[PDB]
Design a protein around this ligand. Sequence first.
Ligand SMILES: Nc1nc2c(ncn2[C@@H]2O[C@H](COP(=O)(O)OP(=O)(O)O)[C@@H](O)[C@H]2O)c(=O)[nH]1
Length: 315
Amino acid sequence: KVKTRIYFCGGAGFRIGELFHGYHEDVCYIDTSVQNKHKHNTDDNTIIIEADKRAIGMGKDRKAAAELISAHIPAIAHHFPAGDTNIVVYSMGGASGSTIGPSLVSHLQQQGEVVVSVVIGSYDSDISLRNSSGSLKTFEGVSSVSKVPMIINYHENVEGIPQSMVNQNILEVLNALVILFNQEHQSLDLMDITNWAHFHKHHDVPVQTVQLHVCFDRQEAQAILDPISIASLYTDPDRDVSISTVLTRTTGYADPEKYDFDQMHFVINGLSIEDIRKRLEERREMMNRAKANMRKRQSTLDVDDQATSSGLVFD
Ligand SMILES: Nc1nc2c(ncn2[C@@H]2O[C@H](COP(=O)(O)OP(=O)(O)O)[C@@H](O)[C@H]2O)c(=O)[nH]1
């Protein structure tokens, strides 16, 4: 098994993967569109799921995408087998990443794998907000069905903010995660990472969506409310000090000769998910208000009008 398999799904996943290229060898790409392919997509690392016969995307139709892709998931998972750790990357407001991604997480978690999702919330229209809300609900559904808390590292496409800034934050996270999982750190074993992610095995906590916060100093980790499970890396072992009360804690000692960071923390909590739910709820309340206030014009047809079988009408 590879140490870390990264699954880049849908357009956002493809774009992030193109930016991330060279930072990790064991990556793969799954989409419903050939258009999203770029210079780093090969026949060996990419699966394009064709619809009855073309691959032109799903255009934010989450239900259609799910109908298409669901039956292909076992084959895809067989083709790109799980790593010791697994990272799945996709947008929430689209159609393909937000179905392929969570479907892969569900399949992988049912096999007992360790999985983290890196995801993007959006709400630039009624349909994409509907998609992001469905995706948030999906995380909860996948947590329930796979019986393993679904871990999401969440990024919002804040209306008005250049997506390039969100992409950069995501790359920083993917880089940090790859280091965390690289199996080179003293005192940090594979089962240590496994039980950090699968903390539900040892604690009376709800099996539900949890949020992963990648923190680059002590103070950022400290700010995370009600932490459930924390993995910490130090280049100086003498700095290994528990930050706050936490259910599971695991630490690794990174080579200070190789690494120019003091410490990194990967903090899982549950509470922060509520902030996402609340944010989408508020956007939904605005959207429904706007919808309900849209003016509906009278038909241009009179009751005295006649139409031909093609729809031609003569005045
Ligand atoms: N931050 C960021 N957001 C993206 C990127 N690509 C797409 N998105 C967002 O994701 C939404 C869905 O697009 P896409 O991921 O291509 O949909 P999909 O192919 O059906 O999964 C878009 O409306 C954007 O809000 C990207 O490269 N970076």
